[PDB]
Write a protein that binds this ligand. Structure first.
Ligand SMILES: Cc1nc(-c2nc3cc(Cl)ccc3[nH]2)c(C)c(-c2ccccc2)c1[C@H](OC(C)(C)C)C(=O)O
Ligand SMILES: Cc1nc(-c2nc3cc(Cl)ccc3[nH]2)c(C)c(-c2ccccc2)c1[C@H](OC(C)(C)C)C(=O)O
Lengths: 141, 141
């Protein structure tokens, strides 16, 4: 599938909000514990994302997430469009579960789990980390 | 130069602290406005970094930055080593200066400037964004 498609959603765990972005074509993840599930947090996260990867369109499973003028301003500025028409959210949460006692804060456990997931070779042998980079460079060259 | 070398430092602007990571070989940047210049912030940032890129060693211009047990725990966990033996900090700040009135918060202006810098083609024609991805994939293949 297309190299500029991302999925963005918020799970909850321990009374906190985890924003999770998946690079659809590769399965690569960025996630962030956010204080509140708001347009401002989402806008900000999108700007961070877009400055790091070529982000053409973003899908979500909660469309209402994308209605705030704040979010609209961020996709306007970065040049992003919504997607209208895995779950890595289960798996990520499987991994957080495993590493939870290795860290005091949920946020640290999240980043441990992002790390584990992104490196883990899918022997059949690339990792998600290796695939996104290969796909985006592939698509340069 | 080696594809797993990163530089990490904190500039100040408007009474706030900006953590800036540079991928040395490419000139690609990740930056983040942090509330305080502490070991905890640095540790956390390093975990985020390492889960996204293959991070072998990290250089800094303030070695004392890396002495806290907190920071040590993060490079231990992610498998990172210090570097002992551009400035993109001028340039980044040039760009923040330019975009400042486009955003209410310093943090947004930072992310705008990271975006601008990472995409900007160095016509001679790749961007920093294109080079890191090419270098890391290059180094896979
Ligand atoms: C709060 C916190 N405190 C300490 C910690 N620092 C210490 C310093 C001393 Cl002197 C003794 C015990 C100590 N424990 C550590 C070592 C970590 C840490 C855990 C795993 C990997 C890297 C660092 C965290 C961590 O939070 C971040 C720093 C990443 C924000 C967490 O959520 O567990
Ligand atoms: C605080 C804030 N508020 C609003 C904003 N939202 C609005 C909603 C309405 Cl209804 C009217 C005016 C509005 N202005 C916007 C549109 C932005 C924004 C600026 C540039 C690109 C994307 C979003 C920010 C922004 O901060 C983040 C959201 C990115 C954390 C900033 O620092 O300027």
């Amino acid at each position: 599938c297309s190299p500029g498609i991302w999925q963005l959603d918020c799970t909850h765990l321990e009374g906190k909000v985890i924003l999770v972005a998946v690079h659809v074509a590769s399965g690569y993840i960025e996630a962030e514990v956010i204080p509140a599930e708001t347009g401002q947090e989402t806008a900000y996260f999108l700007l961070k994302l877009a400055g790091r990867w070529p982000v053409k369109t973003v899908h979500t499973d909660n469309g209402s997430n994308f209605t705030s003028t704040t979010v609209k301003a961020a996709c306007w500025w970065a040049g992003i469009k919504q997607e209208f028409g895995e779950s890595m959210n289960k798996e990520l949460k499987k991994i957080i579960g495993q590493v939870r006692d290795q860290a005091e804060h949920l946020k640290t456990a999240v980043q441990m789990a992002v790390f584990i997931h992104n490196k883990k070779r899918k022997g059949g042998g690339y990792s998600a980390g290796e695939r996104i980079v290969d796909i985006i460079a592939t698509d340069i060259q």
